[PDB]
Curated annotation (Swiss-Prot):
Subunit structure: Component of the BRF-1 ISWI chromatin remodeling complex, at least composed of SMARCA1 and BAZ2B, which regulates the spacing of histone octamers on the DNA template to facilitate access to DNA. Within the BRF-1 ISWI chromatin remodeling complex interacts with SMARCA1; the interaction is direct. Component of the BRF-5 ISWI chromatin remodeling complex, at least composed of SMARCA5/SNF2H and BAZ2B, which regulates the spacing of histone octamers on the DNA template to facilitate access to DNA.
Compartments where found: Nucleus
Whole-protein coverage range: 2054 to 2166 of 2168
Transmembrane regions: none
Tissue specificity field: Expressed at varying levels in several tissues, whereas a smaller transcript was expressed specifically in testis.
Task of the protein: Regulatory subunit of the ATP-dependent BRF-1 and BRF-5 ISWI chromatin remodeling complexes, which form ordered nucleosome arrays on chromatin and facilitate access to DNA during DNA-templated processes such as DNA replication, transcription, and repair. Both complexes regulate the spacing of nucleosomes along the chromatin and have the ability to slide mononucleosomes to the center of a DNA template. The BRF-1 ISWI chromatin remodeling complex has a lower ATP hydrolysis rate than the BRF-5 ISWI chromatin remodeling complex.
Domain Bromo: 9-113
The species this protein was found in: Homo sapiens (Human)
Protein name (database record): Bromodomain adjacent to zinc finger domain protein 2B
Family: Belongs to the WAL family.
Amino acid sequence: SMSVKKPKRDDSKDLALCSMILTEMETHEDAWPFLLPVNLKLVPGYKKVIKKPMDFSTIREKLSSGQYPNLETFALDVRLVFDNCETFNEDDSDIGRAGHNMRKYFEKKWTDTFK
């Protein structure tokens, strides 16, 4: 509360470490469905169903331009990419399975890096 603060967690490396995690997601062989925004003109149903589209290139631009106020807002956009994928793709599709694999990969890096 006022003038009563919990000890200061060192966040000075958070930007660089989120960038590294994002690089590892970008270079994973199963990243291909997630590299670019879904083409809303060419994928019927996507625009109406998926209210907040997100992809790795968009996260990379947000990260590079100071649009994440903290590491939690970054993890929220990563998870959005997988939640969108699960909403639109069957679990037993190439893209569906990609999304499960990448979420697992991400969550392990996240825990090992920050928790």
